[PDB]
Coordinates of C-alpha atoms and ligand atoms in Angstrom, one line a residue:
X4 CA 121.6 133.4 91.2
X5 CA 123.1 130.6 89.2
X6 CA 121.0 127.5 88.0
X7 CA 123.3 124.6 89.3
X8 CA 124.0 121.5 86.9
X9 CA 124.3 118.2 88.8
X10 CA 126.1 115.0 87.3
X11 CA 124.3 111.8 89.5
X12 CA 124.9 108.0 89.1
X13 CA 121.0 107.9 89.4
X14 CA 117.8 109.2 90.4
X15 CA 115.0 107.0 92.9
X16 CA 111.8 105.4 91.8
X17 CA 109.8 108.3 93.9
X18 CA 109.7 111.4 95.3
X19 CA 107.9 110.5 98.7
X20 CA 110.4 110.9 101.3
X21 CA 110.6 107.5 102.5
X22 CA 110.3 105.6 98.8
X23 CA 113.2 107.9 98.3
X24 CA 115.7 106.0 100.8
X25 CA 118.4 105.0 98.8
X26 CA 121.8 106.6 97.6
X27 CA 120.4 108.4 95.5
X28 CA 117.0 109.8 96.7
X29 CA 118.3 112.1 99.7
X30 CA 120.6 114.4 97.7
X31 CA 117.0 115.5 95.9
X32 CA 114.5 115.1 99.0
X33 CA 116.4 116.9 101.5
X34 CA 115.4 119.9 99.3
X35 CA 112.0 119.4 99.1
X36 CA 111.3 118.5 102.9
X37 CA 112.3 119.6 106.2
X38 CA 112.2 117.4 109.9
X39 CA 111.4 118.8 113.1
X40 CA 115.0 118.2 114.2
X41 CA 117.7 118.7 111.8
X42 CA 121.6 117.6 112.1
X43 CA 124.3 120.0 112.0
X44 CA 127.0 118.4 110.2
X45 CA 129.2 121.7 110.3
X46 CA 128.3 123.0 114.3
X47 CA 131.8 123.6 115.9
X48 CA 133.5 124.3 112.4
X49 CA 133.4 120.7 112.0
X50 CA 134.6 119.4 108.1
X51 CA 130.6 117.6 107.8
X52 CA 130.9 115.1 110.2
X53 CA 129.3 116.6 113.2
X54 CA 126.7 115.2 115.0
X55 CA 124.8 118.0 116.7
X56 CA 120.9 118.2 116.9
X57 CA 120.1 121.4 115.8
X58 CA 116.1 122.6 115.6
X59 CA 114.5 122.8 112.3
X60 CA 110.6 122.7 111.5
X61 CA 110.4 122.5 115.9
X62 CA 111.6 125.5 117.7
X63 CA 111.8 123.2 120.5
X64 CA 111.3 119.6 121.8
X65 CA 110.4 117.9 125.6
X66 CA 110.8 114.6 125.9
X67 CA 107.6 113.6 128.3
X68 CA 107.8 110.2 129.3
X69 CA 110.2 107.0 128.4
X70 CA 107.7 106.7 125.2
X71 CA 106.7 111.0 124.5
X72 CA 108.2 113.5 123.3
X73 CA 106.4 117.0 122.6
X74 CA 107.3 119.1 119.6
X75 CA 106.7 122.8 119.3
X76 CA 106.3 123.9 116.0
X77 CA 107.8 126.9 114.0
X78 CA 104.9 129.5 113.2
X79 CA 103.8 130.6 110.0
X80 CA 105.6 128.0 108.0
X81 CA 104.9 127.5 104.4
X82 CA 104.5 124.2 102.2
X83 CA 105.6 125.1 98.4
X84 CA 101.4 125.2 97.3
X85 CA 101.3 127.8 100.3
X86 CA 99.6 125.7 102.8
X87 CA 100.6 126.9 106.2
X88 CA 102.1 123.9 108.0
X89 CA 100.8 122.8 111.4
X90 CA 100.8 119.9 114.0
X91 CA 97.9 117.9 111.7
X92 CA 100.6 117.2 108.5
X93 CA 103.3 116.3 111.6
X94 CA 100.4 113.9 113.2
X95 CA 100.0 112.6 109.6
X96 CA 103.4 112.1 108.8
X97 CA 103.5 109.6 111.6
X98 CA 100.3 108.8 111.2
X99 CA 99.1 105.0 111.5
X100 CA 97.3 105.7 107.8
X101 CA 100.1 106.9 106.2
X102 CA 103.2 105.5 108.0
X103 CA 103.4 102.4 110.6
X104 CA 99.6 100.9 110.2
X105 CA 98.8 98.1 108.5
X106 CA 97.3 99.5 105.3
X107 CA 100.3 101.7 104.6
X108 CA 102.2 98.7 103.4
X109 CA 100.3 99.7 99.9
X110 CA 101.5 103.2 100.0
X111 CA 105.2 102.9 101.7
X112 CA 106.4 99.2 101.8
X113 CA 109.5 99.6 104.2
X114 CA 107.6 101.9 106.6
X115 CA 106.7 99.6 109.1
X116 CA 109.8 97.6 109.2
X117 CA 111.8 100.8 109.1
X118 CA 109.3 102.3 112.0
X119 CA 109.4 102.3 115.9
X120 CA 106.7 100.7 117.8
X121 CA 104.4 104.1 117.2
X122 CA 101.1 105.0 119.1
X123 CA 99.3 107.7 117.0
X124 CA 101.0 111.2 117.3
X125 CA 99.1 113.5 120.1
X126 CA 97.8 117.3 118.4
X127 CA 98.1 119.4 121.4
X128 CA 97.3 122.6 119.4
X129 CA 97.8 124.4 115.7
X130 CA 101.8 124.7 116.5
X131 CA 101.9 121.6 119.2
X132 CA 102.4 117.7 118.3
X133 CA 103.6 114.6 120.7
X134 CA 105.1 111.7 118.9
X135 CA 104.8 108.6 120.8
X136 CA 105.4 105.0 121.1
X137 CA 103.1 101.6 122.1
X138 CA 106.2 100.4 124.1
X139 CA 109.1 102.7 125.8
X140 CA 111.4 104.0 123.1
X141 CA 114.4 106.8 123.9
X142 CA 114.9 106.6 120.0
X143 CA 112.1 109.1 119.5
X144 CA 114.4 112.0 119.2
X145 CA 116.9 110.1 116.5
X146 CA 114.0 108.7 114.3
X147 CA 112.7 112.4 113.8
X148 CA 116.2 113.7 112.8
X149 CA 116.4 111.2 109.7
X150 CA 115.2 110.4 106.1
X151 CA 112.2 108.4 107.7
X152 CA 111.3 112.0 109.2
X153 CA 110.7 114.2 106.4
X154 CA 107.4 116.2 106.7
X155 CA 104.5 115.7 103.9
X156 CA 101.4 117.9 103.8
X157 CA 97.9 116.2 105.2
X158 CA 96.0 117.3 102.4
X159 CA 97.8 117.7 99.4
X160 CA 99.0 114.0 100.1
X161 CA 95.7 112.8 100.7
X162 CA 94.5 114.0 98.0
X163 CA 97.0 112.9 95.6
X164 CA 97.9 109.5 96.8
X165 CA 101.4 108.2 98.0
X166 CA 102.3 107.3 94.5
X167 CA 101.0 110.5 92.8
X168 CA 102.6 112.3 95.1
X169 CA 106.4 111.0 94.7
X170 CA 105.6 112.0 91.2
X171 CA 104.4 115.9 92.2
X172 CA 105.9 116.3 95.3
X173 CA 105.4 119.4 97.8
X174 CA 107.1 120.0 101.0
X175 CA 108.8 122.9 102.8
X176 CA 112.1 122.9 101.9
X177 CA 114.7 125.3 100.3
X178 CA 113.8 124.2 97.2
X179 CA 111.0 123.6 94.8
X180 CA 109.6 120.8 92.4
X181 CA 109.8 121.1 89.0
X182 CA 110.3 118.2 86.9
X183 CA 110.8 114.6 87.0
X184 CA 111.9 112.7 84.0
X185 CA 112.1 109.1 85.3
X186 CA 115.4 107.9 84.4
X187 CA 117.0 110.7 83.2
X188 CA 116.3 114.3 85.5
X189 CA 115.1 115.8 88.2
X190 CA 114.8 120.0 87.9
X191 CA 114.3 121.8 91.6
X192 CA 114.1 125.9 92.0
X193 CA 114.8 127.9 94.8
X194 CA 112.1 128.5 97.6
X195 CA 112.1 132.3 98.0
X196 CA 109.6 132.3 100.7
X197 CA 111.6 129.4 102.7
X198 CA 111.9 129.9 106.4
X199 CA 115.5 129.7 107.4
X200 CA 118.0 129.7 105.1
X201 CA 117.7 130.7 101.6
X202 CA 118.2 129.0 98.5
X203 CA 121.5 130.3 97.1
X204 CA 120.7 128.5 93.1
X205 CA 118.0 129.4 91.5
X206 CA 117.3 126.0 90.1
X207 CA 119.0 122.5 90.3
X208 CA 119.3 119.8 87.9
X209 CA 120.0 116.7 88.8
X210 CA 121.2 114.8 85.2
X211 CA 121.3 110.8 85.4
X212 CA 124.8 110.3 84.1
X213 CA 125.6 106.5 84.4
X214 CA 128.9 105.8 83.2
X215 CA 131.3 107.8 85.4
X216 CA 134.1 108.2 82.3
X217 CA 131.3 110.4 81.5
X218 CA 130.5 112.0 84.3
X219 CA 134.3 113.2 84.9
X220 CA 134.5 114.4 81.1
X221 CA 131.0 116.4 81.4
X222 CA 132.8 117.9 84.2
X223 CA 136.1 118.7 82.6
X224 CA 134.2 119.9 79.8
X225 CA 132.0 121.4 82.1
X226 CA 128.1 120.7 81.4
X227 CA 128.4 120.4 85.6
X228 CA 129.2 122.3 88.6
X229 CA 129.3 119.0 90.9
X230 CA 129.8 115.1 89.9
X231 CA 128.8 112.7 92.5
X232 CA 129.6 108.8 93.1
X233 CA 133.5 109.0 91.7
X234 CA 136.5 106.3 93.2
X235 CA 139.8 107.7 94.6
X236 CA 141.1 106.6 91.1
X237 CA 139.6 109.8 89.5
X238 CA 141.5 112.3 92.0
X239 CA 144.7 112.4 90.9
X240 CA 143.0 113.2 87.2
X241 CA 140.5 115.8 88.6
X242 CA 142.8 117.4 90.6
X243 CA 145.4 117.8 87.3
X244 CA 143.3 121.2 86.6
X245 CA 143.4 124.4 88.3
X246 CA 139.3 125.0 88.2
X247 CA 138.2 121.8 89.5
X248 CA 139.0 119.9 92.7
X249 CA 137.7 116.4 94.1
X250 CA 135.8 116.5 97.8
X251 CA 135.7 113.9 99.6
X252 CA 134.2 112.1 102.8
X253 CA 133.9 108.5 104.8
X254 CA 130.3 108.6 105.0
X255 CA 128.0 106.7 107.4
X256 CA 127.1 103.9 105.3
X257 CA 128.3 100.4 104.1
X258 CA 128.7 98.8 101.0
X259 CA 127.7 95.0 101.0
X260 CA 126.9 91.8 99.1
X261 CA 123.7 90.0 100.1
X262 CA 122.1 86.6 99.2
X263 CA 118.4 85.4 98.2
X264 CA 118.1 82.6 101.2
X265 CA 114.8 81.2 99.4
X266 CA 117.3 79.4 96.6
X267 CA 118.2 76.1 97.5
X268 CA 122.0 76.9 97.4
X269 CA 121.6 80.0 100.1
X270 CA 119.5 78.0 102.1
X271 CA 122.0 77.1 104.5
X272 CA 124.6 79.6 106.0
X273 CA 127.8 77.3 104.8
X274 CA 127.9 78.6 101.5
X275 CA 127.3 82.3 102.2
X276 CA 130.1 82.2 105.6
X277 CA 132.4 80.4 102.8
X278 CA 131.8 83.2 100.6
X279 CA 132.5 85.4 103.7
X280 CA 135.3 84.1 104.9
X281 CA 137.1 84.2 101.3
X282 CA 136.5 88.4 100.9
X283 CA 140.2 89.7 100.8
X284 CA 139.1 93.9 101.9
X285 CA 142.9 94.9 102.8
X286 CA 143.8 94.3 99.0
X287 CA 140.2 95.6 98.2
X288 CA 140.9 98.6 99.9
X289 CA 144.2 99.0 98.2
X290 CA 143.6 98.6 94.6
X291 CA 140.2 100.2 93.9
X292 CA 139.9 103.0 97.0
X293 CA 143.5 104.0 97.6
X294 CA 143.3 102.8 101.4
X295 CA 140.6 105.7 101.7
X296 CA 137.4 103.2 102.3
X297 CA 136.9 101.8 106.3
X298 CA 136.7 98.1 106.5
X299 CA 134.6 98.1 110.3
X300 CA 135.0 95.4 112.2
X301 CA 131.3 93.5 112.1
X302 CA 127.6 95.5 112.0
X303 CA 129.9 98.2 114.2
X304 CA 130.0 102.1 113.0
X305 CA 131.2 104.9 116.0
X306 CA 128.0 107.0 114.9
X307 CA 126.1 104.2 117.2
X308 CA 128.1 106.7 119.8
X309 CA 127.2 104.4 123.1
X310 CA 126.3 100.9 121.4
X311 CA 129.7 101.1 119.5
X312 CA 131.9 98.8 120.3
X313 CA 135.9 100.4 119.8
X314 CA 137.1 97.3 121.2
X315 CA 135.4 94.5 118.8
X316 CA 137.6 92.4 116.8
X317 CA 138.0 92.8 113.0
X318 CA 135.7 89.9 110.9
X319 CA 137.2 86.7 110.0
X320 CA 139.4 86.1 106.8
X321 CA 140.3 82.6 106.6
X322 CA 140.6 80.9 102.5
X323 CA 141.7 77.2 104.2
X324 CA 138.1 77.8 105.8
X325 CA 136.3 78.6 102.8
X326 CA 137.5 75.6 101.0
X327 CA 136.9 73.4 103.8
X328 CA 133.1 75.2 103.8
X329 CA 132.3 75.3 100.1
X330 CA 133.2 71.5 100.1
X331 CA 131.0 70.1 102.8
X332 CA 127.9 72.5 101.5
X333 CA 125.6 71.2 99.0
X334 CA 127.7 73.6 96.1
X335 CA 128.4 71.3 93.1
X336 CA 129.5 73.8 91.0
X337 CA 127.3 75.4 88.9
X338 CA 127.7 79.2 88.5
X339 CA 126.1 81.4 90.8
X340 CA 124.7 84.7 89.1
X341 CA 125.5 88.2 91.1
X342 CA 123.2 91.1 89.7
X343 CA 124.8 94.2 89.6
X344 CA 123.3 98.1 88.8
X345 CA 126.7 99.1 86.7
X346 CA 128.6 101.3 88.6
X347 CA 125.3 102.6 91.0
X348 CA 127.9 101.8 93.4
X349 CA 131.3 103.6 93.7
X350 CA 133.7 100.4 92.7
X351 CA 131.1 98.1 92.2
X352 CA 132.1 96.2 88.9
X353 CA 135.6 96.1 90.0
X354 CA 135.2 94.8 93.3
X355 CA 132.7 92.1 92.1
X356 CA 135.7 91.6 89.6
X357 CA 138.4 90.9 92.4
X358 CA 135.6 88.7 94.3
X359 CA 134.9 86.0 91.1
X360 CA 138.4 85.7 91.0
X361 CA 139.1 85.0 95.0
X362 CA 135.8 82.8 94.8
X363 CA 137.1 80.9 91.7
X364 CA 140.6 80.2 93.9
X365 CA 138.0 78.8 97.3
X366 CA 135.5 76.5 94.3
X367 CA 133.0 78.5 94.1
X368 CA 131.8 79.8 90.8
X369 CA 130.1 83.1 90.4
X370 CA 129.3 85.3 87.3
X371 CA 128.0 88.8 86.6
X372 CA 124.6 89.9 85.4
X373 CA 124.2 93.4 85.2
X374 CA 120.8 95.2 85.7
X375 CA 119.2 98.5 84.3
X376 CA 117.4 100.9 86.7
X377 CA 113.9 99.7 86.8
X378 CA 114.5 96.4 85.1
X379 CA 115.8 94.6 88.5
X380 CA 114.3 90.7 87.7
X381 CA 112.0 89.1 90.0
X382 CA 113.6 87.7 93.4
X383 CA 113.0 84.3 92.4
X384 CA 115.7 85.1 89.5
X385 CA 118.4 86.6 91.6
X386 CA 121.2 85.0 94.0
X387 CA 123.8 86.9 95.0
X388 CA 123.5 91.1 94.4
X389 CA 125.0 94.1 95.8
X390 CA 123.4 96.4 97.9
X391 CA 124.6 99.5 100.8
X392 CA 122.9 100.1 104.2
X393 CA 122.9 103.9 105.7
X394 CA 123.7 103.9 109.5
X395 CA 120.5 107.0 109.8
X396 CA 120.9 106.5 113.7
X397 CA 122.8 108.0 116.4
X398 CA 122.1 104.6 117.8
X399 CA 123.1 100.5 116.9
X400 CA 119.0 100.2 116.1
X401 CA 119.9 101.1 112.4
X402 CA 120.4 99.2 110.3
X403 CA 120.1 96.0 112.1
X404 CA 116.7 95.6 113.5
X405 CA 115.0 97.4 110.9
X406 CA 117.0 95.5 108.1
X407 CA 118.0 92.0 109.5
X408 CA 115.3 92.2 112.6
X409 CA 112.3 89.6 112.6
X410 CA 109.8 92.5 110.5
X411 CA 112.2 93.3 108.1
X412 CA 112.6 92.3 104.5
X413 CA 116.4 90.4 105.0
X414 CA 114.2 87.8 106.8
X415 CA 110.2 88.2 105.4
X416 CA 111.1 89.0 102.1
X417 CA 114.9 87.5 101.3
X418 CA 114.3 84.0 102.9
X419 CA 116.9 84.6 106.0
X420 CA 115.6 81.6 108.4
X421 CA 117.5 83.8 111.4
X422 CA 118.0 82.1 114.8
X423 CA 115.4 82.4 117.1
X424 CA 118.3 83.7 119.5
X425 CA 118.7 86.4 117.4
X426 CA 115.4 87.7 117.3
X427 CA 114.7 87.4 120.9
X428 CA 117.8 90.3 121.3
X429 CA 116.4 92.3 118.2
X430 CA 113.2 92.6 120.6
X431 CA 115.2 93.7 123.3
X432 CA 117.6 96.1 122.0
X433 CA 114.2 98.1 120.8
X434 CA 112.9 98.6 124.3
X435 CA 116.1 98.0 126.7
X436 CA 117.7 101.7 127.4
X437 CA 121.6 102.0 127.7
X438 CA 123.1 99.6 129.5
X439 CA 126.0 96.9 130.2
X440 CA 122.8 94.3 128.9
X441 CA 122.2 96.4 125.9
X442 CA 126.2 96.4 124.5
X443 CA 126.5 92.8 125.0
X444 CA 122.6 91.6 123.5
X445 CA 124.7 94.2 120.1
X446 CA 127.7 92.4 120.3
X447 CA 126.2 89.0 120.2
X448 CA 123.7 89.7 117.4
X449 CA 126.7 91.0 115.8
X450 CA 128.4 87.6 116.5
X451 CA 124.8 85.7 115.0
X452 CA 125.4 88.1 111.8
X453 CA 128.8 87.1 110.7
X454 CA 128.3 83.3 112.0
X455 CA 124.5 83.4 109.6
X456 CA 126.0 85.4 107.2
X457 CA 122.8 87.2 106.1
X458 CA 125.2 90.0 104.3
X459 CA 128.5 90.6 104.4
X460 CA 130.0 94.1 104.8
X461 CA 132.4 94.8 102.0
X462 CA 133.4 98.6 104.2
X463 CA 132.4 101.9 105.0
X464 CA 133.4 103.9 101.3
X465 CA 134.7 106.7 101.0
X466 CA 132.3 109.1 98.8
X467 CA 133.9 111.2 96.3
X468 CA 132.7 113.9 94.8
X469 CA 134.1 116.5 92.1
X470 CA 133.5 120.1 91.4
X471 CA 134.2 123.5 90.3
X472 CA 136.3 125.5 92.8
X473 CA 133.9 128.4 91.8
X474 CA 131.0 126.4 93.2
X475 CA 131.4 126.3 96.9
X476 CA 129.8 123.5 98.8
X477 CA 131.4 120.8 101.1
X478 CA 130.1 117.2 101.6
X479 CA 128.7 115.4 104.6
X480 CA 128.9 112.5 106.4
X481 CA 126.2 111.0 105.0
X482 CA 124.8 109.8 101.8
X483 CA 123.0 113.1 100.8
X484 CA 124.0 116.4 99.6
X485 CA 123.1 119.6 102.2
X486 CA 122.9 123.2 100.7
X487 CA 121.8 125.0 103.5
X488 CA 124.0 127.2 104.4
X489 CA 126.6 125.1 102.0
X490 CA 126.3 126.9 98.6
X491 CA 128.1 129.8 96.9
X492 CA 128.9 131.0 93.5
X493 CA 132.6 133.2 92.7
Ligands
LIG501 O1 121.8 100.9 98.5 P1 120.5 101.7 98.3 O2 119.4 100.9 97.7 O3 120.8 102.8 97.2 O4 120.0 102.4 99.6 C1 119.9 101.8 100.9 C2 118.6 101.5 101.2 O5 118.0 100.4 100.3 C3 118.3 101.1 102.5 O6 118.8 99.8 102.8 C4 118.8 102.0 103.6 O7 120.2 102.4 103.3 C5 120.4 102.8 102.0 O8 121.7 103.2 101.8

């Protein structure tokens, strides 16, 4: 087997599945762990996009009651230390201790806000586990099919601690730890004894390459097999040689700007709807993603399947409005600082560009400050930055209650003073099932979003990658990288 050579934009803090949620931190953990339900992205020779619910570490699942679902576990399942895995690492995954309790804010900080309203899991038997919820939940089944899902072993975990463990991880996955070099590589190798199927590398790197000049010339060259986080600018280059080829995908994710509402300035939602309201994303869209990104039309993605709304108007774009906004706000006219990772983010320098230039036409001032992985300043010295939200939901839950909900960090953390209205339908979205009640309480908190202006959604991009044609492997619909039955060599 060949040792593949990955070229990454950048690597997560940890290694413990959920500390890994990010851009960057599935592509790696996916290989380490397993869930109980997995996604089949390619069931019905569909190009990566499918939605199916396939069975993974649970040969099978019952939903019990409105808030139960039983899981019955594959037997003789091995973590990567060759611990047999049973129902007690399931009932500690979701686990009060190490998940959704109070004293696991120490350990995982977004796992409560990022949780349902969980009851401790049920152990039936060795290979039996019900997962369960305080209040009536039909999300049960979605939650344990993403990246908050990932299953870590009882006592290797305990043992190790939640930090020492994103450090040393062990799962039971395709694929191995190995190394991690914090801001620089991750090395993985193959998981011969993996139930399922088998790892087709026999190692993978994955090398912290920055600039993407770079990462396009180390391909070219080629110290890589597969380049991630490129713009539809590079295709036309990539595509100018007969070994390589560009792969593409709309994944289900968004790319945003966002504000810190504890400043004085981003106190009050004038400011940050003027900001809004001056965002030009058709010429966006032209110049920097070759009309390839998605501009959706409010906190609206289709993979919300029955709380998607086709029929929602696009958001507002109004510059006589922005004026008229940025000059009855409290905005004198001192520049506003916008902290930026580089290019962590496909287009993010040039869109930020475009943006300080359609800002400087509406009054408002606003200047770059660019940030090194692990040196992000304290909150108190940031205003406006750029961040992404993954829709991990088959469901309009995601990211919007967890995110922008009254527990999460938009609001606790970020100073959004959101309207009381709005939290009153995050509450009941959570336990309401489908319904005509349930659409409308979406589409009005979508409404509240672009009226607050919390965030504002730049579009849905469209993630290119770059490879060797000799290195077989198609991209999904999300932002990680599957090689499960999705890797070849010849
Ligand atoms: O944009 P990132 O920090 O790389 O990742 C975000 C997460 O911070 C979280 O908001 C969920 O969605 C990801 O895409």
């Amino acid at each position: 087997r060949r040792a593949l050579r990955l070229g990454v934009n950048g690597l997560p803090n940890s290694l413990e599945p959920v500390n890994a949620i990010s851009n960057v931190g599935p592509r790696i953990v996916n290989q380490i762990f397993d869930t109980l339900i997995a996604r089949d992205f390619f069931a019905k020779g569909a190009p990566g996009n499918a939605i199916d619910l396939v069975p993974a570490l649970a040969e099978s699942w019952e939903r019990i009651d409105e808030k139960s679902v039983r899981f019955k576990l594959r037997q003789k399942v091995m973590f990567h230390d060759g611990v047999e895995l049973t129902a007690d690492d399931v009932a500690y995954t979701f686990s009060s201790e190490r998940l959704w309790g109070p004293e696991a804010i120490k350990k995982i900080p977004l796992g409560k806000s990022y949780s349902l309203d969980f009851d401790e899991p049920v152990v039936e038997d060795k290979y039996t586990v019900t997962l369960r919820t305080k209040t009536p939940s039909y999300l049960i089944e979605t939650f344990v099919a993403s990246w908050m899902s990932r299953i870590v072993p009882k006592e290797y975990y305990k043992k190790l601690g939640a930090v020492d463990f994103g450090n040393k991880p062990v799962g039971t996955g395709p694929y191995k730890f190995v190394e991690f070099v914090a801001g620089d590589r991750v090395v993985l190798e193959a998981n011969d004894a993996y139930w399922g199927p088998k790892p087709t590398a026999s190692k993978i790197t994955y090398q912290i390459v920055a600039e993407p000049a770079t990462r396009v010339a180390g391909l070219i060259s080629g110290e890589y097999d597969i380049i991630t986080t490129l713009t539809p600018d590079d295709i036309q280059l990539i595509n100018s040689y007969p070994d390589l080829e560009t792969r593409g995908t709309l994944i289900e994710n968004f790319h945003m700007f966002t504000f810190n509402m504890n400043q004085e300035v981003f106190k009050d939602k004038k400011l940050r709807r003027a900001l809004a309201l001056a965002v030009n994303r058709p010429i966006m869209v032209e110049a920097l993603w070759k009309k390839q990104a998605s501009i959706p039309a409010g906190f609206n993605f289709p993979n919300y399947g029955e709380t998607f709304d086709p029929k929602r108007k696009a958001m507002e774009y109004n510059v006589e409005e922005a004026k008229r906004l940025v000059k009855e706000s409290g905005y004198d006219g001192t520049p506003i600082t916008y902290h930026t990772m580089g290019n962590y983010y496909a287009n993010a320098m040039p869109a930020l560009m475009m943006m300080i230039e359609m800002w400087k036409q509406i009054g408002v001032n606003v200047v770059m400050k660019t940030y090194a992985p692990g040196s992000f300043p304290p909150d108190n010295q940031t205003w406006m930055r750029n961040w992404s939200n993954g829709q991990w939901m088959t469901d309009a839950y995601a990211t919007i209650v967890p995110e922008f909900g009254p527990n999460g960090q938009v609001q606790k953390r970020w100073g959004w003073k959101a309207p009381a209205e709005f939290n009153e339908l995050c509450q009941k979205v959570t336990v309401l099932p489908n319904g005509k009640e349930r659409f409308d309480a979406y589409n009005r908190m979508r409404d509240i979003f672009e009226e607050e202006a919390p965030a504002v959604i730049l579009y849905q991009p469209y993630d290119v990658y770059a490879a060797r044609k000799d290195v077989h492997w198609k991209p999904v619909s999300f932002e990680m990288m599957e090689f499960r039955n999705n890797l070849s060599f010849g």
